[PDB]
């Protein structure tokens, strides 16, 4: 559901400063209306330009090619009930937006932090040798094999319409 957007903005031009500077950002958001709001949240803190005093020049939407599985490293900050913290996370996904979906669900589940509690500092691709987290690194290898981690899930699902049967089914492994 996440999407990559590039936003340009600038302070409204005046007599003291004709041709103000242009600032660009990369944003991940579910749509164009949330993305432009998040651009004004940062430009107000980092550059002290409220939304009343500036204008947005573009909301570029960028669609990425998948088809191969890469590593990503996300540097972010979030807020808990006792303060603010920094954190680095690693994930394997096919596009950057999909890697941000995975991050937001792990923050929501293990830290209970929602979307507006989180500021993304950095998102970059990480080559296989340079990985630093054990979970990701296991799969950055040649020849990884494991048996199915939950084959019971197949059997139960079929038993939701086939409510009564004549023998208890097996779980092939």
């Amino acid at each position: 559901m996440m999407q990559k957007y590039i936003v340009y903005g600038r302070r409204l031009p005046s007599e003291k400063f004709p041709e103000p500077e242009v600032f660009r950002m990369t944003i991940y958001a579910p749509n164009e209306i949330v993305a432009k709001s998040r651009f004004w949240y940062h430009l107000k803190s980092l550059k002290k330009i409220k939304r009343t005093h500036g204008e947005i020049l573009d909301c570029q939407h960028i669609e990425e090619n998948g088809d191969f599985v890469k590593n990503f490293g996300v540097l972010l900050r979030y807020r808990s009930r006792v303060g603010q913290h920094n954190m680095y996370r690693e994930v394997r996904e096919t596009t950057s937006a999909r890697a941000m979906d995975k991050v937001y669900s792990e923050m929501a589940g293990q830290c209970r932090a929602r979307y507006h509690d989180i500021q993304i500092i950095n998102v970059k691709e990480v080559a296989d040798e340079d990985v630093r987290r054990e979970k990701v690194a296991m799969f950055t290898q040649k020849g990884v094999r494991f048996p199915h981690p939950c084959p019971y899930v197949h059997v139960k699902r079929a038993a939701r319409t086939a409510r009564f049967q004549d023998r208890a089914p097996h779980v092939p492994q």
Partner: protein, 153 residues
């Protein structure tokens, strides 16, 4: 409240402004006032004769009487569901000429002036509440790249 004399609750509004004590400057008495003029009421706390009640500080009214020493001013005052037209007599140290219609006389003079000039077509003279901006191009040759920063504590 429990005590409601004429100058109750006046500790700050009737006090003088910092380094502005003493006698009023003599423009207070050389101004010319006319019937129908608009004025502001501001109490000078050093002049105790013809000093209006604290309710009238910071209101705007109209001259109805020109007396030898004091002016008569009409104030619209809301009382519990209706407006009342009140008339008071106030000495010169507590009145200043008001500019509430200054902007309107400049525009009326400017529209008749810009009509006389005709630019052969008459320009639009209605005031315009700020419109949404028009389309334009802007350069992005030199663009700065910012990002959120890390927490420092």
């Amino acid at each position: 409240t429990h005590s409601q004399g004429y100058r109750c609750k006046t500790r700050y509004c009737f006090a003088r402004k910092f380094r502005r004590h003493g006698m009023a400057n003599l423009t207070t008495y050389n101004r010319v006032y006319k019937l129908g003029q608009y004025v502001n009421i501001k109490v000078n706390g050093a002049y105790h004769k013809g000093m209006p009640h604290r309710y009238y500080n910071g209101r705007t009214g109209t001259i109805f009487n020109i007396g030898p020493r004091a002016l008569g001013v009409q104030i619209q005052k809301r009382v519990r569901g209706r407006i009342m037209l009140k008339r008071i007599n106030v000495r010169l140290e507590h009145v200043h000429p008001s500019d509430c219609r200054k902007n309107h006389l400049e525009r009326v003079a400017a529209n008749d002036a810009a009509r006389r000039l005709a630019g052969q077509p008459v320009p639009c003279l209605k005031r315009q509440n700020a419109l949404p901006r028009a389309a334009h191009v802007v350069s992005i040759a030199s663009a700065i790249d910012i990002t959120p920063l890390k927490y420092d504590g």
